DNA sequence: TGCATCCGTGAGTCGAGGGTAATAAGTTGCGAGTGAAGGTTTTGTTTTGACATTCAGTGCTGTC
């Protein structure tokens, strides 16, 4: 029942509030108990990383800002830490992703509309 | 003691519109130097064996 409210706030707050699990522990419950409370609902929450990589991927293709704002806008640690997450997930360079004139759904994790 | 032959000064602030013209040899080599161009070079930038580490994904256990 209760932690429905985490789902689309996370659609809205992968932004300027740097939310970690202890910042996600501000949703009422503990660090370890929110995990399995999210697990049997969804199957897959720390999804957040995907939204961070999905949520950064609105900035590559659909806004004209270059790459250095992107690795620090949507709450990743660094430009290699971004591309470490990028290459584990999308298996590309984002300089080889946005510059390419074609773009399809290989690595971009969907948001949970459960 | 003149005789002239040159030297060197004539106030002070603003406004004023814009400005130059005479004349003239060619032909010939050859050297030093502005470009375009050979893209390769020194320096900006991309991923993988892995481990101390933070951490999130597994179930567990414990309480009120």
Angle at A65 between CA A64 and CA A71, to 5 degrees: 135
Contact A51, A109 (CB under 8 A): yes
**CA distances from residue A35 to A21, A23, A61, A66 in whole angstroms, order as listed:** 9, 13, 32, 35
Whole-angstrom Cα distance, residue A74 to residue A36? 25
**A66 Cβ nearer than 7 Å to chain B strand:** no
- Distance CA A19 to C1' B40 in A: 50
Whole-angstrom Cα distance, residue A6 to residue A69? 26
- Distance CA A27 to C1' B25 in A: 100
Whole-angstrom Cα distance, residue A102 to residue A82? 21
**Which residue numbers come right before each break in chain A (C to N over 2.5 Å)?**
44, 46
Buried b (16+ CB within 10 A) or exposed e, A54-84: bbbbebbeeeeeebeebbebbbbeeeeebbe
Contact A3, A34 (CB under 8 A): yes
- Which of A58, A96, A93 minimizes the C-alpha distance to A74? A58
Specify the experimental method. cryo-EM
DSSP readout, A20-84?
-HHHHGGGSS-TTHHHHHHHHHH-----HHHHHHHHHHHHHHSS---HHHHHHHTS-S-HHHHHH
Whole-angstrom Cα distance, residue A43 to residue A61? 30
Query: What is the structure's resolution, reported in angstroms to one decimal?
Result: 4.0
**A33 Cβ nearer than 7 Å to chain B strand:** yes
- Which of A30, A17, A6 minimizes the C-alpha distance to A111? A6
Give the bases of strand B that a protein CB approaches within 7 Å: 46-48, 55-60
Which pair of structure tokens corresponds to residue A3?
């932690």
């Amino acid at each position: 029942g209760i932690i429905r409210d985490l789902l689309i706030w996370l659609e809205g707050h992968l932004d300027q509030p740097l939310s970690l699990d202890n910042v996600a522990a501000k949703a009422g419950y503990s660090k370890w108990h929110l995990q399995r409370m999210f697990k049997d609902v969804t199957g897959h929450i720390g999804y957040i990383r995907a939204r961070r990589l999905s949520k950064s991927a609105v900035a590559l293709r659909l806004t004209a800002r270059p790459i250095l704002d992107i690795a620090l806008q949507y709450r990743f640690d660094s430009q290699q830490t971004f591309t470490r997450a990028f290459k584990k997930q999308f298996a590309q360079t984002p300089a080889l992703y946005r510059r390419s004139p074609e773009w399809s759904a290989f690595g971009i994790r969907p948001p949970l509309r459960l």
